[PDB]
Design a protein around this ligand. Structure first.
Ligand code: HEC
Ligand code: HEC
Ligand code: HEC
Ligand code: HEC
Ligand code: HEC
Ligand code: HEC
Ligand code: HEC
Ligand code: HEC
Ligand code: HEC
Ligand code: HEC
Ligand code: HEC
Ligand code: HEC
Ligand code: HEC
Ligand code: HEC
Ligand SMILES: O=S([O-])[O-]
Ligand SMILES: O=S([O-])[O-]
Ligand SMILES: O=S([O-])[O-]
Ligand SMILES: O=S([O-])[O-]
Ligand SMILES: O=S([O-])[O-]
Ligand SMILES: O=S([O-])[O-]
Ligand SMILES: O=S([O-])[O-]
Ligand SMILES: [Ca+2]
Ligand SMILES: [Ca+2]
Lengths: 519, 519, 105, 102
């Protein structure tokens, strides 16, 4: 049984916590729920930590008083098919292997599944740790509650004696680095300086041995990623997002200065040895668009290359932890602004970007976003109860599972089948254009070896490589983005038509050049 | 937003609260969650209350941190048919009007429905308040959440200007009195002295004007009826139960002294002006058999008459609030011990007992009780989740809704249909004997007018009236008890055969006496 | 495991069984499926039973070769409500007790 | 939950079958290019020996009806071997074609 501590003692040294805790809805929640600070209090001074207090980061720390939200979060959606590779004819990107050749995603890229599994799935995917980590056996893939209790309760490490990234099976890669983990867990929130910069007070940083870092992390999507544990108010903790919104002054809605002001973010900084160390972003409102944008964005979380001179950009560089915070039509400019690309295509040699799940940047400017709808309205709606205290469902999943609450309360003119039909019209149309974009990209890619072996000039090949950059960007955004166009159907259509146009331009350029070599 | 208070200061005067709160699982739960004591603390001494602090009795006080339990409790079971009269051919007691004639239950006795409605249903039933109280309209009968928020949010009073019990419609009765409310709410827990005895510190007592008392009461089945709010430990608050178990030394299991010792109750008394005022019973274990026995027992909560001389026993008498704490075969002796009966039959003139829902006393000695099974195992089981934190369902309802958890985890040899079939075999057999018991009781009752008109002696009529007491007791126990034999099928069988035997004996006696008058 | 007996020997005394068994669709079904007659055959004459043979009356004697019929027979219809008294208002004879008074039913 | 466990194995195994086919097809399509570029029989026979293994360690799993369920670790090890062999053959043929061009 917990015994309460005298918070007044802590507040003497922790004035920011005092200001947050005494005012918010956790004013009565004693520190002992989340901290063991007995030896800390005995040894600390006003500027020196002394003994480090223990801070609980397990989700059960919140489940004691918020069982409904916790249980809704940890539910596993068995209909979200697990470990389903996207580079197959029946999934999102039938020609992905040809198009992505040269990138680590060629080793494995599955569809997402329920949030409970995010940290374990990050650890076990074939592209991440060379196959070092596995579930303890193939039965454990079902165990969402176990994953939430902790990754290392359900996983095994092939070699606990070494800490290097290496292949344990042939067709794996070692793409994981410490930046990835910021979108899987915030167990490291007190051990990682803002942006993962080197810092005397940080145990972990961008340049850490990721296998060692991995072993220290346990819980997925901690509850405090969206809710300040001291004030209970809405927030984000993700450094990359704070950096885009606040440091670079782009705002929470870069296309809408008014909405950015009404629904803004306030950066709060915590220090170690009176030096800035970590930060959070307090939100003006409980705005799920910005909460979910901690992870559901296009980002750099990886080394790459400079567009200018082709030189390596390593994990030590700030650009290795970057939120572009740009929609598809602004992305190329945003990559040029930091002078960065991800990989060289294995066949064409083109410098290319790698896009990842840009849901937040895609949603901007869409009909629903313009009408003040947010991610949670469709993906974590309020529960409807004939007799009961309403709470917000935390089972972040497709609205197909809860159409009454997610769609039909707003769309009174529709039955469930009609609303589903409207979704499918958009997804079917968008997917058809994704498949056509891949057809044309593949046709272009296959001409590169033909052109090379025909003696086509480097000048022509480089012209085609510049077109490849755009053809790829305006296609891959949409295989990366999870709504298959639903979040912004007109933008998807315009982008995918642009992809096809660019590929067709490159095909004509290469075909003409090959033909001139033959004649 | 709540602001915590200094609990240590309260403990300078409240030593029993200190001993309970600091040790249990609510040690970190600040008093401000349930008490507004600002002016109290300013004015109190250890010997004078000063300003009375406010205590919250609403269930929302607990729902803030225990939403799952609250929502499971407030759910309305629409399949529990509402306002369904038991004195009909398709319900529990087809001949109830003939058999109960002379008692207030003849005005209305419906089947039970969901716990959310207990206080509103008590207020609106035709037998209780002369029809003074109604739902605001007939739509409100569905509103369980509204009833829980408070009775007076969903009910209206025909005459707010008067406080007397009287008939507002012809076919109603005014059977309600303050003792009833103890099994519908404990909003009055700080305003009612133990047993409802007169007390200088009690606003309300057994002799209060029940209409005035009613207006001060709001919430059904407060959460603290089973859980101490200070220690969070298991308890009962019902005075009549504590009186039977502790004061009269009967024990929690009168037929099992060993189980009574292992699963016992400790009486804790609170004083006003240094005189005993109220009490609670802390349980050794979380024993739902005893928690549910706060209400699901046979009781006096009414005036009656003495068996010895027929004189009135009014609400002022301690016997007007009494738990018999006796099985069916011990009940007559228990009623003789307090010299009490309920009513005289309108036709036969017999002194008769009135039985109510003796589930706890029926369950004793049954195969399930002897095997350590308790009410909650069948009616409040743990929830089964593929992934989730387990909690205890508070939707206290038939196991038919949750057979996997209620029955089939124990009875692995059965399918759901087999378990239901076993329930129905018992209920069908028991109901058949109830119907035959009523047939024979009705036959006997109908002979009384014939015998009187034939000039049969008072001596013979009195011998028949003595048999009527037993014929009635051994039948009505089983229409009152809600399981239709399931809780103790062999006892139901033995009892109902005894009822029929007694009625047959009386029929023989009267027929012979009538026949002798004709001859 | 059952061992077949010589049915022809039985038929030296049991002529009605012979006429029935040899003609019907159990002509190939040996007597040992339903009778243990070892001591009987040793002691009987055409005019004296001797030791009484054992005859199986259990339904499993037939279920061995006719499982489908046996399983369809033994199935319990849970919808046929059990122990349901007919002398109740919701069953077949609401006034049965008055009308049948004097009878064991 | 049991269905989900089956599907995890089948989905993972099928993804590796599709990737094995992608790499086998890429290798196969280089044979006519190599032949018409004048790549030596010695190199073509080296690639043919790799084709035997690339094929075996793929086709076992399209032939086998459980899509990996009957032995998920073996399917994984085999299909990774198929991909490795195809990749080895692709690199051999690409290098030889390029040397003929230069
Ligand atoms: C002054 C004497 C202090 C008292 C009293 C308490 N803490 Fe403290 N704490 C103090 C310092 C100087 C530091 C280092 C950071 C800084 O602000 O300079 C801390 C650190 C913490 C932390 C962070 C630990 C980590 O892993 O980084 C926590 C969670 C913490 N302190 C909690 C805490 C609680 C709950 C206290 C009351 C029981 C408390 N502290 C007292 C200085 C002082
Ligand atoms: C019990 C001791 C609690 C623990 C542990 C946690 N929380 Fe809490 N929370 C608690 C109460 C009594 C309330 C107020 C309820 C009300 O409506 O008045 C809260 C509130 C929240 C909220 C809502 C805040 C708001 O609307 O402003 C959130 C988002 C919340 N709590 C989250 C939360 C998380 C993430 C926790 C683990 C770190 C957590 N709470 C612990 C009681 C308790
Ligand atoms: C008992 C006779 C079993 C039957 C029928 C099935 N399974 Fe099984 N399974 C069983 C055992 C004893 C084990 C090993 C358990 C251990 O922890 O040591 C398993 C293993 C599995 C696994 C994991 C396989 C792996 O390679 O790690 C899965 C996914 C599995 N079982 C699923 C499963 C399904 C879907 C079945 C019906 C088709 C099934 N099993 C049958 C025991 C038995
Ligand atoms: C936040 C900006 C992220 C960073 C940094 C990383 N990932 Fe991620 N990942 C993120 C989201 C929002 C999703 C779900 C949506 C989707 O498109 O899948 C994911 C998903 C994964 C998965 C599961 C799906 C799959 O591709 O197999 C894995 C295995 C995964 N992510 C691994 C991973 C690695 C190795 C990272 C660093 C190189 C990494 N992620 C970074 C959000 C974010
Ligand atoms: C961001 C991705 C979130 C994470 C992680 C968690 N919650 Fe949450 N929560 C989220 C939103 C968008 C909302 C609704 C805000 C609104 O006003 O519309 C909530 C709400 C809560 C509340 C308030 C009561 C309610 O509305 O249900 C509580 C108590 C709360 N959330 C708790 C909670 C817990 C315990 C979490 C970890 C299991 C958790 N939240 C994660 C967004 C996010
Ligand atoms: C309703 C108007 C929506 C809002 C607002 C958001 N999304 Fe959405 N999303 C929506 C639909 C109809 C779909 C397709 C679902 C289907 O079953 O066809 C999606 C899809 C997603 C997905 C993939 C879900 C899956 O395939 O299981 C993700 C990861 C997703 N959406 C995230 C997301 C975020 C982060 C949002 C706010 C920026 C967001 N969505 C808004 C409907 C709606
Ligand atoms: C001594 C100076 C006291 C302090 C400090 C507090 N209380 Fe008190 N309280 C006190 C007395 C003498 C009484 C009368 C009952 C008795 O024990 O003789 C009370 C009564 C209460 C009650 C019951 C009120 C009722 O309706 O009957 C409550 C709920 C109560 N007190 C709570 C309380 C709290 C929460 C305090 C700290 C904020 C507190 N009391 C201080 C004496 C004293
Ligand atoms: C949040 C501020 C709370 C309020 C208000 C209430 N309770 Fe509570 N309760 C709370 C916590 C943090 C815990 C401990 C959880 C754990 O498992 O550690 C509890 C516990 C209970 C229990 C279980 C007690 C046990 O010994 O097992 C019960 C039965 C309980 N709480 C009931 C309860 C009731 C009836 C309340 C209203 C009067 C109530 N709680 C308020 C947090 C909070
Ligand atoms: C606890 C010992 C109780 C006392 C005192 C009273 N009632 Fe009650 N009541 C109790 C239970 C456990 C039940 C449900 C089980 C059942 O057999 O019904 C009830 C039910 C009611 C109902 C609804 C059913 C009905 O008869 O219409 C009403 C209207 C009701 N009770 C009214 C009532 C009145 C007027 C009382 C004092 C004279 C009274 N109850 C006392 C438990 C207890
Ligand atoms: C709109 C054209 C209606 C249709 C069709 C039905 N109802 Fe209705 N109902 C309606 C109104 C405007 C009112 C009065 C509302 C008020 O608050 O004053 C009602 C009332 C009822 C009631 C309460 C009756 C009472 O005497 O107090 C019930 C139980 C009710 N309605 C149920 C009901 C059902 C079951 C219907 C379908 C058969 C139905 N109503 C049709 C408006 C309309
Ligand atoms: C007696 C009739 C009860 C009333 C009224 C309430 N609860 Fe309860 N609760 C009850 C039992 C028998 C149990 C299980 C005890 C066991 O260990 O088997 C519980 C349990 C709780 C708990 C503990 C966590 C859990 O097991 O779910 C909590 C937090 C709790 N109950 C809260 C609660 C609230 C908020 C109530 C009013 C809505 C409530 N309980 C009423 C018995 C009884
Ligand atoms: C399982 C072994 C049981 C235990 C222990 C208890 N009861 Fe029960 N109850 C049980 C059954 C199978 C039934 C009949 C349900 C049906 O749908 O046929 C009952 C019935 C009740 C009822 C009436 C419920 C209704 O008709 O909706 C009540 C009020 C009831 N039981 C209360 C109760 C109490 C208070 C118990 C502990 C003393 C108790 N039951 C034990 C199964 C089981
Ligand atoms: C003549 C020497 C006999 C031979 C060879 C067998 N049986 Fe017989 N059996 C015989 C007699 C005289 C009787 C008495 C009845 C009669 O017909 O007079 C019997 C009786 C039976 C019975 C019935 C036993 C009973 O419980 O009544 C059976 C089932 C029977 N016999 C079977 C049987 C079989 C299977 C034989 C071959 C192994 C057989 N008998 C030989 C005379 C003779
Ligand atoms: C296997 C050794 C058998 C045992 C033991 C029993 N029977 Fe049989 N039966 C058997 C065969 C091979 C056949 C013929 C099937 C066909 O269609 O050719 C039968 C037939 C029957 C029939 C149908 C007879 C008809 O004329 O249509 C019936 C009704 C029948 N059998 C019943 C039966 C009973 C009741 C048995 C136990 C006393 C029994 N059989 C044993 C094979 C076997
Ligand atoms: O209050 S915090 O800034 O130590
Ligand atoms: O690799 S994560 O970004 O999908
Ligand atoms: O602690 S209580 O008894 O005043
Ligand atoms: O101890 S009390 O009487 O002040
Ligand atoms: O009247 S209550 O006891 O059913
Ligand atoms: O054949 S029989 O009649 O013995
Ligand atoms: O034919 S007999 O009697 O032996
Ligand atoms: Ca990227
Ligand atoms: Ca009674």
């Amino acid at each position: 049984n917990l015994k309460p501590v005298d918070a007044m003692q802590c507040f003497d040294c922790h004035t920011q916590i005092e200001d947050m805790h005494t005012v918010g809805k956790h004013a009565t929640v004693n520190c002992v729920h989340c901290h063991d600070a007995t030896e800390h209090v005995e040894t600390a001074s006003s500027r020196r930590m002394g003994e480090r207090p223990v801070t609980r980061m397990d989700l059960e720390a919140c489940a004691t008083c918020h069982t409904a939200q916790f249980n809704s979060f940890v539910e596993v959606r068995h209909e979200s098919h697990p470990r389903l590779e996207k580079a197959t004819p029946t999934s999102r990107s039938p020609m992905f292997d040809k198009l992505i050749a040269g990138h680590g995603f060629a080793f494995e890229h599955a569809e997402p599944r329920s949030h409970a599994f995010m940290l374990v799935d990050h650890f076990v995917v074939d592209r991440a740790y060379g196959g070092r980590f596995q579930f303890k056996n193939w039965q454990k893939v079902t165990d969402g509650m176990g994953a939430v209790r902790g990754a290392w309760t359900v996983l095994t490490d092939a070699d606990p004696e070494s800490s290097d990234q290496r292949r344990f099976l042939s067709q794996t890669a070692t793409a994981a680095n410490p930046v990835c983990l910021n979108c899987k867990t915030q167990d490291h929130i007190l051990d990682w300086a803002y942006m993962g910069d080197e810092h005397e007070a940080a145990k972990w940083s961008r340049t850490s041995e990721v296998v060692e870092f991995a072993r220290d992390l346990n819980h997925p999507l901690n509850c405090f990623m969206c809710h300040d544990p001291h004030s209970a108010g809405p927030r984000v903790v993700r450094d990359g997002l704070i950096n885009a919104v606040v440091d670079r002054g782009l705002g929470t809605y870069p296309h809408d200065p008014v909405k950015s002001e009404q629904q803004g973010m306030t950066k709060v900084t915590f220090q170690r040895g009176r030096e800035d160390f970590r930060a959070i972003g307090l939100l003006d409102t409980a705005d799920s668009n910005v909460m979910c944008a901690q992870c559901h964005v296009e980002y750099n979380c990886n080394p790459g290359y400079q567009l200018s001179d082709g030189s390596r950009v390593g994990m030590d560089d700030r650009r290795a932890n970057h939120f572009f915070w740009a929609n598809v039509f602004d992305y190329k400019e945003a990559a040029q602004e930091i002078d960065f690309f991800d990989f060289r295509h294995a066949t064409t040699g083109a410098a290319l970007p790698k896009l990842q799940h840009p849901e937040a940047e895609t949603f901007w400017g869409s009909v629903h976003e313009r009408n003040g709808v947010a991610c949670a309205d469709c993906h974590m709606p309020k529960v409807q109860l004939e007799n009961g205290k309403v709470y917000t469902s935390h089972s972040q999943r497709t609205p197909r599972d809860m159409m009454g609450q997610a769609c039909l309360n707003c769309h009174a003119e529709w039955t469930e089948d009609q609303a589903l039909y409207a979704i499918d019209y958009i997804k079917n149309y968008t997917h058809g254009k994704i498949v056509k974009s891949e057809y044309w990209l593949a046709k272009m890619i296959d001409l590169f070896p033909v052109a090379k072996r025909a003696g086509v000039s480097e000048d022509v090949l480089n012209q085609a490589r510049e077109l490849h950059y755009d053809a790829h960007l305006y296609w891959e955004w949409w295989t990366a983005e999870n709504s298959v166009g639903f979040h912004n159907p007109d933008q998807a259509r315009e982008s995918l038509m642009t992809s096809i146009s660019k590929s067709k331009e490159a095909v004509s350029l290469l075909n003409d050049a090959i033909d001139a070599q033959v004649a």
